[PDB]
């Protein structure tokens, strides 16, 4: 399996034509699962889920979607509440590919998008796996913005290699995962004017009149499906106190917490996450 | 596998001879695991772990021990801090069977015993799996005693079938698990004068000068092994707020929480618990 | 100051005529404050707050209102979501008495009423003091229903003296404040057939399709005034973990917790409660 | 009242002569109270509490002690666990001045000192007021080190004006209280080479084999006096989740949280803090 062999585009109508890049793998398998990546500068599906797609594709028909503003998907300068916008695009894509009810796996921003999809198109989302997700998280103890969110903001105002490395280093518990190569790859994608356009837009997108659509912790008591929340204990972007409203109010919630793990569970605990996800979504 | 085929006794010296009943299964398998049951009136290994022993014995050499005061183990009228007393007996048993370093799985009182064993005989305990455990739990929000602990106390003062059924019903989320048969079986064992002797003794045992040995949440920062905490979200004996000090202070802690699950995870979520335990202890 | 000397009535319109009973004291004091009692059986303004009123009336013009269904207020057999019903009744009373913007003090159900009033009529609510309040409380760790709520439901199905006693005993840390007289007084008021119809009416309302208006933890991020949350550490009805969402999301929140105090803060910490309320509402 | 008019010195014995500087005010007031400042760079009694002292001295005989390593107290290059070292120093001062049992008010490091003093010399500590205290705080949800602790360590490795400014900005909610003057004042006191040796000494002590004496969350169940915990909701050094163990396990605890307040409660909520302290220590 490669970036190139798995690569696909579709066009959907979200207030006009919108190009979506996605990867597709395990076309043999009956059970489709959609993967939505995290929302850090230069993130995309292939790199966010590089320790996961090969393993999951042995069990499931994998659709790993570059959310609008990321990877090879369109990067408009203007859009409404990000997770609602990404959810509309994904819904466009589900209609185009003929999908009915499909489980979703989402990290950080992608977990926000998964939850917003599942609330707006309730019959279309099956079981959710959400790792350190935004939107349904409300940090009952951590003063906002968190150290992770501050570093992301500092990069958007001053997009240097140094500010990106400082942001990546609060993503993980073990700093040695943030290798000179990783930083070079992410910085190369993040620093394009198209990406910085997207990165700005996404910032503004959260502080408007539809901020209510970002407070998904008010709405997840309505989710009827099983939902696996996965968190690193040392997550410094969306800390662990942000799991508590969702775990209480989602009737069929489960929570797994990993000690010695930051915001990137799917990377730092890839094997345990792969096995939780495979088991939770039914072995395929 | 049966109660009778698996049954074993040993004698160990804990301030004088002490008869221990245990079950042994999967004698073919290299990896030994010890199972310690919960501490409710009439609990014993075989019934506490009846949805678990057969599955676990396919992977591991299972030693499911009736703690002192329970099952077919001696029921002395007098003993010190219960978990320390049960830990000394288990340590006696490890020396007798030639065990070195062995993983432990423990529910409620049994989790207390596992943790006290792991602190007092640190080189002798491998990975721990603890479900709704006593001792390391400190209920930061729930006023003590909890509804579960009150019902256990009311039974010890007035040991009727009605008080036992009221206690069993706050053990589980789904009340239909508390069948007329289950109540009859547990009540028959719980109501013997030997058992009520044990049940009284165990009460007194916690409120002495060595109450510090029961506050294991002060000492688990010293545990060096991986530790899987498993909780039901609706546990009304040792509520979920009681997981927080252990999850924070145990360096290699993990936490799994099941929605729609009470104090008896190994029963109400038997399949998910069996698979967590098998995976966490290395597949065997 | 007596029940009779302070006793007042006003007729307001909520789907027709509605008789409201209230107590008035400290007439001529510059600052008016409205007290709203809790939802326990036979609860009323004068029994809930009798001692606190004499003290607050030294500083404030106190209006202590019997909520619809309680004390000498109308006890209809049916109504919508209680807190919006009680808040409309209260709005009627504010309009009739020409009250502008007034601080509100509420215990349990009355705290929810105060909050629903402060969200629906924002310009009419001043500073809020909420003791162990309903509606904006969401027990993130305590399984629902709590011990206190279960003993309230039990009384409501089997309205005996002995079930009322069981309920009152989990309102307080010091069970000696539950005198044979207090039981007799409250049993007398709770067991009249109109009060019984008012508690059967309360049943259907909280269990009915207008439940979202009860979930004010979703809404209190709109409150613009200072809010003082007051909690007994040992509250067994609305436990301390229910404070966390309101404390996080109300911009100008404060929380005060008293050790060795149940749900009835205004009784068990009488002095410290009066002094907090007086200082927080401005000394008068 | 001035630095010079209130300034006092006393020589006490802790592994030899130790010069302690303190401030005294409100001489002749019946009730003595000891204030203990925080551990930030260039922290001292008079800078930490200057405004609060004038107010508390209207009611109390105030002794505001510079802890060893700070202000004008001796700045040794080495010592044991700081809080037991500072508490022994304090015991020396209480013995020299013939103080019996005295209430203590402590911020951050000084709160830990107050607690260690109250556990080791139980008959000499009265009521405690602890603002965002160290030692008895255990951040159950915040990964350690916190943002505040990291900026303190950074200053300590690279003692520039700009690193001190970064530290002070995460002490407060309103970053405008961090004046160019405050920076200049604190940089002046923090950057003297003896203060530098005192912070390098502080390093080795907290990171050394005497760390268990620092973990007072394990011990505060022994405190028999009333304890008032005071917290800024937005505390980025010792965040609000660190209050929970002390609030649960101190029998006569109270907690007060202020919204829109950082770690420096005594500055950012000056009035409400003075009034709580005055009321709680008995009005004087």
Curated annotation (Swiss-Prot), chains A, B, C, D:
Site (Transition state stabilizer): 108
Key word Lipid metabolism present: yes
Induction info: Induced by KstR.
Active site: 263
UniProt GO cellular component terms: peptidoglycan-based cell wall; plasma membrane
Pathway: Lipid metabolism; steroid biosynthesis
Keywords: Aromatic hydrocarbons catabolism, Hydrolase, Lipid degradation, Lipid metabolism
Residues that coordinate or bind substrate: 39-40, 48, 107, 109, 186, 264
UniProt EC number: 3.7.1.17, 3.7.1.8
Entry superkingdom: Bacteria
GO BP: biological process involved in interaction with host; lipid catabolic process; steroid biosynthetic process
Coiled coil residues, start to end: none
Family from the record: Belongs to the AB hydrolase superfamily. HsaD family.
Name of the protein this chain belongs to: 4,5:9,10-diseco-3-hydroxy-5,9,17-trioxoandrosta-1(10),2-diene-4-oate hydrolase
Gene behind the chain: hsaD
